[PDB]
Amino acid sequence: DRGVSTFSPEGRLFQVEYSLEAIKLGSTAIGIATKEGVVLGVEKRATSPLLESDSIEKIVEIDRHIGCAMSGLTADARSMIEHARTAAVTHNLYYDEDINVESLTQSVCDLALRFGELMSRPFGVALLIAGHDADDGYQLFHAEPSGTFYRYNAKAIGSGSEGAQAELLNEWHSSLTLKEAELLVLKILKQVMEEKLDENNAQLSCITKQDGFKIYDNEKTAELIKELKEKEAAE
Amino acid sequence: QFNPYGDNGGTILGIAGEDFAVLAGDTRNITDYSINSRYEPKVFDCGDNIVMSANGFAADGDALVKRFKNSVKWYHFDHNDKKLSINSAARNIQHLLYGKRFFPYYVHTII
Amino acid sequence: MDIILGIRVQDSVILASSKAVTRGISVLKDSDDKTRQLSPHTLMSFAGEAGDTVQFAEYIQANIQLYSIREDYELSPQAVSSFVRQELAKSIRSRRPYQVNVLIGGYDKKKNKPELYQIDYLGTKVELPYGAHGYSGFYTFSLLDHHYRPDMTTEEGLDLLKLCVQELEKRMPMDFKGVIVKIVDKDGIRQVDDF
Amino acid sequence: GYDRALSIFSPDGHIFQVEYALEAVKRGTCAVGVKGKNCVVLGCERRSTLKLQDTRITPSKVSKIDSHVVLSFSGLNADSRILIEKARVEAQSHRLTLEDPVTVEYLTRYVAGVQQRYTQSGGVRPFGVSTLIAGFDPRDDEPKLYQTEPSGIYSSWSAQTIGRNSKTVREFLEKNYDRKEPPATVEECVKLTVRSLLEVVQTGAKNIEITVVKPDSDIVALSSEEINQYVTQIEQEKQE
Amino acid sequence: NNYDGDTVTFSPTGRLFQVEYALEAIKQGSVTVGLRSNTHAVLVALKRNADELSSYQKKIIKCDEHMGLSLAGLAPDARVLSNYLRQQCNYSSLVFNRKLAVERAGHLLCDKAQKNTQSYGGRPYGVGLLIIGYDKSGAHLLEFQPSGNVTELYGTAIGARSQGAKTYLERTLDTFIKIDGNPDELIKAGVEAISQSLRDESLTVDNLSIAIVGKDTPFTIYDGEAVAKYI
Amino acid sequence: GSRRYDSRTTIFSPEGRLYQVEYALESISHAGTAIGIMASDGIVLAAERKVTSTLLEQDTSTEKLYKLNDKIAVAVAGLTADAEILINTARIHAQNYLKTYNEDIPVEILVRRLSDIKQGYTQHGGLRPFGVSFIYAGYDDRYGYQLYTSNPSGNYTGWKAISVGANTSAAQTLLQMDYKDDMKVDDAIELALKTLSKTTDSSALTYDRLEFATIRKGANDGEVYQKIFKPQEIKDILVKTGIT
Amino acid sequence: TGYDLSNSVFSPDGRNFQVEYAVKAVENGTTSIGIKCNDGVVFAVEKLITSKLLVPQKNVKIQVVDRHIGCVYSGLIPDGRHLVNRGREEAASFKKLYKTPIPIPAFADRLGQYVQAHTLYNSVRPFGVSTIFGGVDKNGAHLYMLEPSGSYWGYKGAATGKGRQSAKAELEKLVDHHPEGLSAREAVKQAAKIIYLAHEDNKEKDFELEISWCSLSETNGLHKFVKGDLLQEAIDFAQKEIN
Amino acid sequence: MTDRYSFSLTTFSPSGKLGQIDYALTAVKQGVTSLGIKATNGVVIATEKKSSSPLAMSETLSKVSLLTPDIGAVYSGMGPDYRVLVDKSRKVAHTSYKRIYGEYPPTKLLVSEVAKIMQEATQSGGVRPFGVSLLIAGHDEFNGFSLYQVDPSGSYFPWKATAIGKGSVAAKTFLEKRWNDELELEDAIHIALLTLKESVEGEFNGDTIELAIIGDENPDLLGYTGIPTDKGPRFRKLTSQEINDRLEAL
Amino acid sequence: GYDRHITIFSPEGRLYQVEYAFKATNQTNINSLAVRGKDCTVVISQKKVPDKLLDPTTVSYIFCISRTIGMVVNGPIPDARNAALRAKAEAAEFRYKYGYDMPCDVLAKRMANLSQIYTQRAYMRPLGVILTFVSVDEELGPSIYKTDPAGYYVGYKATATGPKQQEITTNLENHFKKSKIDHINEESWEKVVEFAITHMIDALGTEFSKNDLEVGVATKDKFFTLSAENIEERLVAIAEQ
Ligand SMILES: [Cl-]
Ligand SMILES: [Mg+2]
Structure with a gap:
């Protein structure tokens, strides 16, 4: 056939x-970084109404100060999360401190290119890693299966990404509040989702210095969806 | 039978002030009843405003200080030149020392 | 651990095991249960080196429970004892052997017979009407040799067991803080809560 | 050792x-899971192309992983045994170290993890198996039902089916299963499960297996006659 | 064709x-310049962003107190090679x-890259x-290619449009x-050299x-407002 | 490198089938027919040797029926050499179990073990599967008399009567027609031989083309006997049942 | 066909096409030569000046093995370095066990067996270099040349690279006109000329000359680079001959 | 390096054929004819010494080989494959039997061990099957005299008499007419020589024919006296003269 | 058609890579010959030095494997030296383990077994060489044993290898048909070398100078190669009768 580690003529x-194409088929995930915190939101996309949607876990805690959202072949993410959690905890054991968000991201991205003929193929999932540390404040990173990670003020991944990213281009500014970011993620998720957005097929989360990483209740998100509807009808 | 350990004597002293800290040590190095050196530095600046001394068996003392200095260097490489805080340095040194739990660095360390 | 006794009567097996756990100078506990249920109709008591006893017992328990789930079937007492003996016989030539002696009291539902197996840490297995480990036999066997009958009831077994414990309490230097007694029969395993 | 990367991406981002492992699942006999208010029922199809079978000894489709959790499957039978063995070992290992039996979610997460691993390990092919894992968490009376598939993704279901003609029985369940009011009794849950299989099975004779799991390690498999009474009652109501 | x-x-x-093909990945990478005198050696690197929300990918990595490099191409490969240098310096x-x-x-970099070009299963660095x-x-200033070829130079440039900077240095x-x-x-x-490789975009902070x-x-x-002095 | 020459023996087809398993089954369909019939008072194993010669030493020959232990026997269909590899592993597994538990291995546990080995060759290792189908005839004190079959996929099932090898479709139909649950060994002996006589590709069924075995509790009292029939004994049972 | 897609496959001719393709990489490389003199050997190589930005005299091509052997090669430079690294390991182990420095014929076979080993399997690629090497041992001077196939012989003179035909013709003249032999200092001068003459095949870009030598009288049997006045003298001699 | 061929080179084709085994059998078919005949008091194995050149010393090439003192082997097909199989057969007779039981293996079990080696070359990674068929003759106390054939697949069958290689089909028909259960060893040798003459083109004598027997114990070939229970090998290779003597009574 | 790239069977039961390795054997265009005397074994081989830049002393296809065993190779030099190094290692190890010198026929068998492995194992290619081993064995006397890429080997009264082997073989065959003995009935090895060179001249139809030949001689307890001047003395004796 051909090598798994083969270069194209380009x-x-x-x-x-090819793994990047698999990620394009994945459900949408959006992150927005502000000076009051970083917000992470995902499309759940249940394949059937009998599937209990609260068992869909596409937003995950890595440590108290670092959260993570995924898009693509989500099964592939489990070992990546396991490694991330282990790295975060291990660094605390060795250094009696929180690990930097960038250092955690770099540790995850080191796994990416460890494939050949090690694992048999790259990961088919992209990650949005959001967190806070004392040195660089609130941060959002986009970790790819290429091993490359970019820091972002805001970022969307998955099937509705390029439409969402264009929207994030216009909406983001350096003075956004946490509440403004929450509504903004919901607004853009609603725009790109196939089904109508509600508290059962979408999920929000955030990371703040004070309270750390928190996945939002369906009741809490439902209020923010209602607040969104009213302010869009306001003009 | 071969004895991997020895005693190079020496005495060190660390005192923490309100907004300062001192780490002192004598400069004499010995074996048994002989003087090896009247000036062999024992307290070392390890960078990041941390001073260290590993008193006892000098070979293990030098090895440990060398490895810690090295750990400071790689901490900067791996974590965007972040300053290694004294508490983090201490926890790191515990792991260096316990790594040889069953063949110990025969030293009493102070930073 | 110290005293573990076993007696096979007409229709059941009775295991008696001391409650004391001594760590050198002090008695740290006086209510320790030195036994594990391997299967619904098989009980194993144990005594030997600290740590190794429980580690071994729970390891054996896990393995028998695994077999029970895989086959949907309870192994005979004889089969379980043979499995345990092999594990100990394997252990004795290991880097660090399990220093654990056990009694396996089971009721064979196929043959409708109680069975008592004594196995020491070397993997020395014997099927007996009554048995013990350590010094326990030295005090008790002369009483059991005299009074034991194969057609004894469970109540008569418990009475002969009381006489054995009394002799232990009289002539043994160590305070083993009494015994926990358990009965294994066709209906399974149950603890005698007053002894 | 044999290290060949069998599971790899294609230009369109597919593995x-x-x-193709899912296609093996599609070929397998239908399996269905339905959770009531205080029970879960696992129904399984038996293809009647094989008679002269010895049903006493032939491997049953539903397997106990522990005294409180069960696993059924659709796909390659030989592959399922490897997942079942691993799950059973992990169940005893969990009891040994945590001193508490596995939750249904944990056991599912483990089996799904094994399946995922076989999709990016060298020299191995994925399991041609999807599973339905059901039971009750220790000291808990809330019914649990999960599904896994060759890719390694897993999720919780109020009711679900897998295998051949599972599209049809899922259609049935989607219109017949109400979330606000699930099958309140064992009878109702078994009835709805047998009904869902009768959409696909053929004869209601030795072609339907039913296993009921209740809280506190109460698991029992229904016999031919017991199931036959459900089959009889369903069609007599249908003649109207 | 049949041999790739x-x-x-x-x-x-x-x-x-x-x-x-690995060499081709470098040409797609962003431009970076190197040049030296007898007392100092300088690296200048045009960093590339994904979009306006994104950060600019870092190009320069420190290997020791007296040594470091700039990269063009696959960034993870640069991390592997720079890590190896750090270890060898150490x-x-x-x-x-x-x-x-x-x-x-x-010499060490050359030999490490070479092993990846002669064995089955592996791939060259990109x-x-x-x-x-x-x-x-x-x-000193060195230029490393993943073919294994390492060259000592007064000045050079690698990446997209590097030919403009390379001609300028050849004049200067x-x-x-x-x-x-x-x-x-x-x-x-060095800033004037890398400017000969810019089109449409200019050097910002x-x-x-x-x-x-x-x-x-x-x-x-030097990054951020530390290079505003040179803009 | 080496990848070029790799057949990839352990992959799915687009339809979700295992190529090699399917092709191994095709191989087995050309092997001599083996039949197993379970009765209340014993089990019968009958099998056809493939187009033999007059110069073949039959009385010392064995290609179909093998003993795994005193309680369990197998009939083979497929590559004889592949079978013997598995047979020796099975014999060892039985003895390992006997040494560990001091009890004879239950029939299903042995069958599952061998079947798991076959399964492994379809999922990992990049090797070709074993081109063998077994009929297991055995007895234990839990389920009594048991018949199983396993094939290259590693899938196994239990049977009252079953055939493997050539003409299984025709053979299974004939067995399904005449089999009854209250049947006895002597009746099962007759059914097995009659079924082979009709499905055989040879002109006539003779003693030199057959291997025959019975597992009976026709062993004096509460025990089980295995009887691998001798050439003269196969000749006698052919006359008794009225085939020659 | 398809016999040339994989290393170690015999074609119907009985040829290993992958080795023959490696030769093409060698033929594409710069010119390098070797001259056996009276009590030693001289090595020289053409270094193409791709640009003015190359620092003169810095990118050294000739390599020393142990203290008495010199190695130069044409083709893929990294492959040559890999071979020399192995050569240095072979020489070290030989001296470790046997005390004496490795003899040149012994050293030649060590390289030869290693290169030949890379024609036995499809999991490795043949070496993309022809190596000219040699030095002084207890039996005197030796000059060798080693091909991608693993084939090597002893030589009076050797040449490889793009200008090998030109060089060979020049070397053949020296062999004919000096049956008694050539001195070390003469060989250095002649080496400079031959590289300058062989540079006609690479006439587009200008080049830098690099020479080394091992001689019993001139260097005490140790490998040394020709530097300063002696190098300039050889350059002048070479420039005079082309005009 | 490393052997990176960890996958099977013999695989099932759509029709259920194992190509490499079939092709190995084709190589055996091209091979020189060899045969075996079993008598009441012995076994005979024979083949033609097809000399590649008249300058070659064909006595140095042994087609018939002693495996144990009571077991002998002959082949048809690829000679080098046969040679290494004989080496492995001799060693396995010791490692997996004699070093355990203090006696040589019975014929059937040694055959079984050789068969296992040939089967593994049919399934293991990065190898082709052996391109030979073997005929192994032997005696042991409890099984008496026996003759076995072993094919590239690893399958083996016991024979009263048989032939393999070039003219096997014609030879087997010749053996069917002549063989009975009352043959003495000399009668079997006579039939072996008659059968082998049909498949031989050129010279037919003791120098171009290799023939060995498994028969009576040979105390003269033991090499030592003093142990009554040790009575010597039953395998004996016939000499060039011994063959020619029986070619006059032919 | 990958059955022609690696050592697996073609539908005809053939191994094409082995057959093509036999063809590589004649790539050097060199012919060799070996014969046996009463007390010696002589091997001769053509020597061709086509380049004037070559050191002719280093151009050789005859190897001293052990003190007693010599080996001439027909095939490319890299594979030749590969086989030479191995044979030397095998001969040394044999002596160490078993306490006596490795016989010529045993070494031939060992190298033949190694070659057989390359015809069965896929990852290893055959060596494109034919190896002719010679000695005066302490048990068997003068010995010639030859190995090829198929893993075949056999003892010889005399033998020839190369592009023109058939002409040399037939020439030798005719001589031994006359004499009716298995060797050259001659006391001294010098005359056996003269016989060998003479019959190669007759068979090939070419004359030889001292630099056109390469000669190896095996006697009791040593194998040695002749110098150009030793060969010259041999050629002079041939011309003088
Ligand atoms: Cl060997
Ligand atoms: Mg090969």
């Missing part, structure tokens, strides 16, 4: 480029 | 070996 | 296509109490590196080599990345 790894 |  | 399926296969004309200091010579560092350093024989050769004891003027020459090492100057990286 200078790209076939398998990495 | 075909994982997708 | 793996790195273990020569073509009929004696070419290694997988290596050549092994030299710990075992021999000796700062690793820049030329020896180049990144080009510019290594600067100040050792016992003064200032006699001027910038003489910029001794003046770090600011040597950086100016979060776009530009500069590094310097010299006689009494540890390897330091």
